[PDB]
Write a protein that binds this ligand. Sequence first.
Ligand SMILES: CC(C)(C)OC(=O)NC[C@H]1CC[C@H](CNC(=O)c2cc(-c3ccc(CN)cc3)nc3ccccc23)CC1
Ligand SMILES: CC(C)(C)OC(=O)NC[C@H]1CC[C@H](CNC(=O)c2cc(-c3ccc(CN)cc3)nc3ccccc23)CC1
Lengths: 654, 667
Amino acid sequence: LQAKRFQAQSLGTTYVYDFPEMFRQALFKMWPSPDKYPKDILTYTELVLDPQGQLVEMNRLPGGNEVGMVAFKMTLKTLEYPEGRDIILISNDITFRIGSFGPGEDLLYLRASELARAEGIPRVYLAANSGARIGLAEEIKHMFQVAWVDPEDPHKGIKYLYLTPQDYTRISSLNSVHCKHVEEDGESRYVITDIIGKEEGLGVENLRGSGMIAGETSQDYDEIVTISMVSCRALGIGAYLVRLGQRVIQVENSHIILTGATALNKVLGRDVYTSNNQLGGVQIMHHNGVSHVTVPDDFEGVCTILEWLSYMPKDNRSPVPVVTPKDPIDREIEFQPSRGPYDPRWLLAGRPHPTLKGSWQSGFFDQGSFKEIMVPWAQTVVTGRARLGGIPVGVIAAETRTVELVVPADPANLDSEAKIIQQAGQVWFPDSAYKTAQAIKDFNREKLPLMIFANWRGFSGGMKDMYDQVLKFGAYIVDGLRKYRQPVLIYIPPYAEVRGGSWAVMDTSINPLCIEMYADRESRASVLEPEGTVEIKYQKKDLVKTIRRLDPISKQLKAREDLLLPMYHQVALHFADLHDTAGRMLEKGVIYDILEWKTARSFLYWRLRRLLLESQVKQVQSMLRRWFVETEGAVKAYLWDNNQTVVQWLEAHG
Amino acid sequence: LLQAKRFQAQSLGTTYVYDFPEMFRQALFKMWPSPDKYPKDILTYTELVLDPQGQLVEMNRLPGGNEVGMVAFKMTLKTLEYPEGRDIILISNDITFRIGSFGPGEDLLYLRASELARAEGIPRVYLAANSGARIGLAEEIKHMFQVAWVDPEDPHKGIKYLYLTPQDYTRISSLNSVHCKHVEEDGESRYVITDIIGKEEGLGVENLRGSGMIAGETSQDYDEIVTISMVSCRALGIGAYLVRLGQRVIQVENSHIILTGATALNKVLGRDVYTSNNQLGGVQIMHHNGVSHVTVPDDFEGVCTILEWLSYMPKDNRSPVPVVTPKDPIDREIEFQPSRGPYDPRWLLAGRPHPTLKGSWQSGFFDQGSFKEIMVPWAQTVVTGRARLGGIPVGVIAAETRTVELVVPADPANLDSEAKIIQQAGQVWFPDSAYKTAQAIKDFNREKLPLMIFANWRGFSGGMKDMYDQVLKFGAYIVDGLRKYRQPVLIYIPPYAEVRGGSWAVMDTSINPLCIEMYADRESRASVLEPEGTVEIKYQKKDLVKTIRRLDPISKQLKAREDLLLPMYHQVALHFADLHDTAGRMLEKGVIYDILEWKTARSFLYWRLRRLLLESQVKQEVLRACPELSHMHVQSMLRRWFVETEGAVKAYLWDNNQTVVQWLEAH
Ligand SMILES: CC(C)(C)OC(=O)NC[C@H]1CC[C@H](CNC(=O)c2cc(-c3ccc(CN)cc3)nc3ccccc23)CC1
Ligand SMILES: CC(C)(C)OC(=O)NC[C@H]1CC[C@H](CNC(=O)c2cc(-c3ccc(CN)cc3)nc3ccccc23)CC1
């Protein structure tokens, strides 16, 4: 017990059978107000496989593992689900054969993953592995013979390897070797054509059990909630498993590798790499978007899992867990967006008052609810989870400030150095387009609604960015949104803009059943900005036609026009901006309704509470409207355009 | 009379839209074998025009008479694959009508001809020669609006607001072209302009809802039907998006696929960085990154590339693959012999027109002249294309073994940038070639094509820069693409080729056992690690020393004998680890269907693919009436039906592919 408990702590990780006590303890932390802690906060049954190759809920004593993989079906008690929520907890045993994957490790991972898929409950995976198992025939190793090209003289080569007829006969019929009988020199010998071995998990068959678990993981992300935690290391198959599950928590001083540092130096020849953390540590994986969040220790990772889960429904057949809000809906929004650049997280989470202490300047979402993912990667777009009157939502927000990308130096070219790049705010770069698509896909498979705070000038059209695939990454936004199954609320806040190519990828017509567009009183939208519109449709000739109409002096002339030209151009710009308003967006029907920031929280809440209520009842629209008319009256029918009325009605009638 | 529009298109380096149908006709004559066996009405088409209710109607009319800068055609084409005819939808911009800009009607006519191709489940062909979303200003309000200056002496002080005189607010009806707040400044009535709407439709944000409409439709099209796009002259904004959402792109030389022009970007940067639109989205960029699958010198050569791509694709999303009678026999051996060292894998696929003599050809795996590659300059460690195996069209993916020389082109925005040469080791999946592979898998799956993988991978790139460039994300896209694969997948490791660890994992039969079939050659290899790797962890100096003591007569002083024997008994350990990596082991462990031989692999895999295709159609007819039956109820039915007709003496021949195909084709 303490021998395995030492081997794990010496490797910096948590011993596998101690993990459920980290879950029971973190549930106490997440729980609000003691004394009133619930009875049986954490209940579980260890998942083991029987000799029939089938899973069984049998409960034993810790340490008694015959395979280097441990799974548990658990029931957790949370503020979201106080009676309990179920998950499947798979984990690698870092003590047993150094966390390698053999047939028995692949099979348990598969059968527990298939059980979570059948129930539709979250699959939480704990990674600490050495990848697929490796093996040579040790029986054949201590018996095999060599036939040299010159028996003097090891140089010149080898003809083949053989077995003495006594030894070929001794290993039966056991099927461990394929041999061709040969009469050479004067002795009978069995040329080893193929080495098979009388053991499982020696080569090729460990890849079939790797493909098996990759395909299952691939499919789970599409039907259930998958979460992966990297502790110590994730190698080859272990690294691909975390990726296919998409939501990765990387502990500090851990690595997500495909091949090791020594292995890569051995192939390349020279000593390129220093460590495995270099190749796939936090500085690589938290920065390129493979890792969603970093944590100091395994305990903190256990907390981040439950934290993410608190935004997610119980299973794939249950709605989002809406909780009684502590922060009211009847409040205005203290924080006010500026015309110039600002941090979009203020717009979401609020901020401490700029001058006053210890005051808080409120934001769109409920205080303390805004939890961001993929923070260091593709900083021109903000991705995360939040709560709106207790409704957990997926959050996507454009960054308006110029950001800093630090491409690290390539240890492979000794003349390489870190490339520093500036990325302009309100722009979808190849990376930010990828991030926006990825968060769309991830939040859709969590069965979460989506909230986008829109502020985009367009996609980057520069040579490098076009070479780097912006066209391909922008197309993935259009499809992520088309495939969206829950409500999508698109909002342009005050002094924000959505221009040409950006609107086209998120418009109501891509998915009208989910997408709804809301524009602020002070927001803008058009094909080009006024400058672009002015240069094509409001040229110098028209500009001179305007002076010779409005200027009373313009009745010599060239002296008067050349003075007013930069002034009547400012006129043209202002004229063009008047065609880009929310007033025009409403007249044309491209948006649902014009919003006012201070009251946008309360409006969007009731509209969101409505849509989620309306969809559950459906799991047909005219049927819902007629049932309102039937119960409230044909005289009250005008209130069907009022969300609070309809919300309070749906919550009552049912 | 309309020859001026024809002259306006020639000067823009493109074809006039009403001349494209006659190019199709001519291209079908070129692609028709031996005259005069030319079929009656090789091309028959109708023009698709929108009615005033916004509905598509079939019209037989004279050219040059469209009142929207978009044109659509419902074409019936007589080809070798379908001699009685196949249907396509042809949509194209009209570069002479408001410079091919996308307005209200242009967007509705693209959406309606697309939905018709969706509803009919047939190919949708789009020819791009556009200018992106249409822009405009309210011209009426322009010659009438007033400026309220903050200091009118003195206009340099700025603008307070723009307004209307009481006179002009009345004149402007009942027209709803402006929105005003009534003001009393100084003493006279002024109607402040708050919002300019405009009389004419298709100015601002309504064009972007029309763009979102067609974007979402093309995105659906690609997933459901065959999508092909060609680029002539230019593809701007929404136009660039359309070609990409359709995925399969032919870019004509000298044309550009861009989001924003060089002039506008230079104004935005405040620096004269770009000199041409070609530096942004010309073939130098689009053909070198995968957005453009192929390039052609002119509009007629690309019209030929569409029909060429179509010759591998079924007539609709319901039909089977167009199987043509083979001119190149199935009964033949492959002449080209893969080497132990690197070779061009296009020699393994298409052969070569003979090394010594000249020669016609030294035969390859596929039928002569049938291999047609896509994405030639992009991610050169993987080869992607289409080909025919005894007249069966397939998607082709082959690992490249030669060390590829990648030229990273100079960034005119970056001052220290030069044309950089990077080395891409053969047999390795990099962030770019993993992406290229998953792109081909996903795209060929939507063509409803069987896939054939000629595998030779050492694994994925594990270096720091490559891990940072997303090799895990892209490698995972191979898993997701093969799992969702719907037609047979024939993976084969050629002679002297290898599949190691990480590379087998992404493509194993367990990902899609209903589709995936694994075959290995007698001279191929596979395992978790390369011999050198297996020997490094599992056959250490301790075991190496032990062997020296057991197999060396002299080793019975000691330390000196073994030190001069260690470099050689090490090579012996490599020989030992390599015999675990043979096809013999792969077959024993049940990881491969069978061990094949290079010479006879073409004959073998043809009858197995003919079998797989024939049986899948039987399985479909069966699971149409009773979708509760499985693949195995279908397997034993045909198996027992064969029993039981031919034997039971010939029962062992249910395992022979040619025999079952012969029984199938006949029965
Ligand atoms: C440069 C950064 C990194 C900021 O981003 C990009 O590379 N692209 C993002 C974005 C940039 C703005 C663009 C919208 N452009 C305009 O509204 C605009 C257009 C034209 C213009 C003129 C003629 C044509 C011909 N159709 C097109 C544009 N000229 C201008 C001059 C000054 C300021 C803005 C503009 C979207 C992409
Ligand atoms: C080769 C490059 C760096 C261009 O590509 C990669 O980044 N990844 C492909 C990679 C996949 C993993 C593989 C490591 N596997 C081994 O089996 C291995 C090979 C050799 C090895 C060394 C030298 C030679 C040349 N005589 C051949 C193999 N040495 C090792 C030492 C320790 C552990 C594993 C290995 C490497 C390829």
